[PDB]
Amino acid sequence: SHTDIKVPDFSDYRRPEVLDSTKSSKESSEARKGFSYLVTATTTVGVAYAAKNVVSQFVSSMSASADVLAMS
Amino acid sequence: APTLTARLYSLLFRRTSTFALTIVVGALFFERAFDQGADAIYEHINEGKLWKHIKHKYE
């Protein structure tokens, strides 16, 4: 039958916060999301710091150089 | 009990609207924090050798 199909054990791959199969995940869910989405946000902040500097440097080359500012 | 990271999720970045406001403001602060720190680290690494260290000398 198709009722012979049970889902294999993911206890190896699971997080610690959802291992107890007698426990409602909802209390941990917000923490589990908050952890992963923090990584993403921290990455975006770190790139945003870089991107700002890279762009600003190219913009500054297009601006007035040292030798023109000197003899102005 | 509301946890550490869940408390961030719940109020700070559940919505994608506030997600960005957090990133922007966090990046605004991070820039000041990191630059200042890494400047000071580089300046302590290279103590006395840069102009700002020997500027009082000739001024």
Binding site: - | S17, V24, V25, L28
Partner: peptide, 22 residues
């Protein structure tokens, strides 16, 4: 109706941005 707090929050997100690079 419902996009007023969202568009205000995105209005803030965009605003600080122009402060972000400049």
């Amino acid at each position: 109706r419902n996009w007023v707090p969202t568009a205000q929050l995105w209005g803030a997100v965009g605003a600080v941005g122009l402060v972000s690079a400049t």
